[PDB]
Every structure is written in structure tokens, then in C-alpha cells.
Design an enzyme around this catalytic site. Structure first.
Site, PDB file in Angstrom:
ATOM      1  N   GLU A 170       0.830  -1.234   0.000  1.00 23.43           N
ATOM      2  CA  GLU A 170       0.000   0.000   0.000  1.00 23.43           C
ATOM      3  C   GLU A 170       0.847   1.259   0.000  1.00 23.43           C
ATOM      4  OE1 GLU A 170      -3.105   0.397  -0.471  1.00 23.43           O
ATOM      5  OE2 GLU A 170      -3.932  -1.581  -0.143  1.00 23.43           O
ATOM      6  N   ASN A 225      -7.851   9.311  -5.174  1.00 25.18           N
ATOM      7  CA  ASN A 225      -8.757   8.414  -5.917  1.00 25.18           C
ATOM      8  C   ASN A 225      -9.604   9.186  -6.913  1.00 25.18           C
ATOM      9  OD1 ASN A 225      -9.085   7.132  -2.544  1.00 25.18           O
ATOM     10  ND2 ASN A 225      -7.902   6.272  -4.209  1.00 25.18           N
ATOM     11  N   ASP A 260     -12.795   9.224  -7.303  1.00 24.15           N
ATOM     12  CA  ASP A 260     -14.003   9.802  -6.685  1.00 24.15           C
ATOM     13  C   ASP A 260     -13.750  11.069  -5.907  1.00 24.15           C
ATOM     14  OD1 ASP A 260     -12.925   8.809  -4.292  1.00 24.15           O
ATOM     15  OD2 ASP A 260     -14.612   7.468  -3.800  1.00 24.15           O
ATOM     16  N   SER A 320     -11.807  11.185  -3.133  1.00 28.79           N
ATOM     17  CA  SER A 320     -11.285  10.793  -1.848  1.00 28.79           C
ATOM     18  C   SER A 320      -9.753  10.603  -1.985  1.00 28.79           C
ATOM     19  CB  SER A 320     -11.934   9.532  -1.352  1.00 28.79           C
ATOM     20  OG  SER A 320     -11.551   8.425  -2.156  1.00 28.79           O
ATOM     21  N   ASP A 333      -6.334   8.420  -0.112  1.00 31.44           N
ATOM     22  CA  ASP A 333      -5.800   7.394   0.824  1.00 31.44           C
ATOM     23  C   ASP A 333      -4.558   7.929   1.550  1.00 31.44           C
ATOM     24  OD1 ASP A 333      -7.701   5.621  -0.301  1.00 31.44           O
ATOM     25  OD2 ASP A 333      -6.273   4.662  -1.476  1.00 31.44           O
ATOM     26  N   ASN A 357      -8.773   5.391   3.547  1.00 32.79           N
ATOM     27  CA  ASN A 357      -9.513   6.269   2.642  1.00 32.79           C
ATOM     28  C   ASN A 357     -10.432   7.255   3.289  1.00 32.79           C
ATOM     29  OD1 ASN A 357     -12.103   6.506   0.791  1.00 32.79           O
ATOM     30  ND2 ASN A 357     -10.286   6.515  -0.429  1.00 32.79           N
ATOM     31  N   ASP A 394     -15.195  -4.497   9.794  1.00 24.21           N
ATOM     32  CA  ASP A 394     -16.391  -3.914   9.149  1.00 24.21           C
ATOM     33  C   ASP A 394     -17.224  -4.971   8.442  1.00 24.21           C
ATOM     34  OD1 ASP A 394     -17.892  -1.378   8.822  1.00 24.21           O
ATOM     35  OD2 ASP A 394     -17.299  -1.367   6.694  1.00 24.21           O
TER      36      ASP A 394
END
Ligand SMILES: [Cl-]
Ligand SMILES: [Cl-]
Ligand SMILES: [Cl-]
Ligand SMILES: [Cl-]
Ligand SMILES: [Cl-]
Ligand SMILES: [Cl-]
Ligand code: NA
Length: 129
Positions: free
Chosen positions: A35, A46, A48, A50, A52, A59, A101
Site C-alpha cells: 500500500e 482516488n 471519486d 477521496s 488514501d 480512505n 467492518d
């Protein structure tokens, strides 16, 4: 801070990731390698809008507030900048929330594509832990 492999494994172990939700420490080190290349300061935008953040590329759509991801949540109740600290506490604590989650470590695309199903114990080989 750019961690060494074993240095990160030790930090992760001390903050309780080893076998957290059943994921052995190698899985977490492997995920951090791919990562962020073990860099707490890593950021990536990203499509969209957003971003990271940090060693585990957490995110801002869901997990932290960066003030520029409209309509997003902050489920870890932290500024995203906290995830860039040389102290990995915030990242590890937010990672524990993520992995809990429902989707496990599949939340981390690099984990799913480069760690899952591989010999992850290699990542903690030779380390003093
Ligand atoms: Cl090291
Ligand atoms: Cl390495
Ligand atoms: Cl392991
Ligand atoms: Cl905030
Ligand atoms: Cl630390
Ligand atoms: Cl799981
Ligand atoms: Na957010």
C-alpha cells in the site's frame, strides 16, 4: 517515516495487530509494503475525489476527515493527517475498525491482490519479535 520491515512488524505487534480478527502479523506487514512502501507519509488520490493516507492507505470516503471529500464519513473520528504520523497508533487503531467492518482485509486492494493466499510469514522472517 519510512519503516524497515522488521521495525514495522514490531510496531504492529506492539499495537495488537498480530492475529487481530485472525490475520497474522505477516498479512499486515505485506499490506503496508504494497500500500505505501512502508512510508507513513504516503498519500494517493482516488477518482471519486477521496484520498488514501498513511502506511495502510486509509480512505477519506469513510474513515477520516480531510475537509475535501464531500459527503464522506469519518468513522475513525480522526483527521486524515493523523494517519501520516511517524507514530502508527492512529493508523493501527483505524485499521482495526476497518478489518472488523465485514470484508476483513479485502478492504485493502493491495492485500487482496498481492498478499492474500501467498506465504505472508515471509514478511516477518528474521525479525525479532
Ligand atoms: Cl527493520
Ligand atoms: Cl522489504
Ligand atoms: Cl505471519
Ligand atoms: Cl477532523
Ligand atoms: Cl509507532
Ligand atoms: Cl475475515
Ligand atoms: Na471523510
Amino acid at each position: 517515516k519510512v519503516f524497515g520491515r522488521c521495525e514495522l512488524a514490531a510496531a504492529m505487534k506492539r499495537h495488537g495487530l498480530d492475529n487481530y480478527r485472525g490475520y497474522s502479523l505477516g498479512n499486515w506487514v505485506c499490506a503496508a509494503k504494497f500500500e505505501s512502501n512502508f512510508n507513513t507519509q504516503a498519500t494517493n488520490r482516488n477518482t471519486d475525489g477521496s484520498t488514501d493516507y498513511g502506511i495502510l492507505q486509509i480512505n477519506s470516503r469513510w474513515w477520516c476527515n480531510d475537509g475535501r471529500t464531500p459527503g464522506s464519513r469519518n468513522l475513525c473520528n480522526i483527521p486524515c493527517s493523523a494517519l501520516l504520523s511517524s507514530d502508527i497508533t492512529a493508523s493501527v487503531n483505524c485499521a482495526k475498525k476497518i478489518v472488523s467492518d465485514g470484508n476483513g482485509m479485502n478492504a485493502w486492494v493491495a492485500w487482496r491482490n498481492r498478499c492474500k493466499g501467498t506465504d505472508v510469514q515471509a514478511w516477518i522472517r528474521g525479525c525479532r519479535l
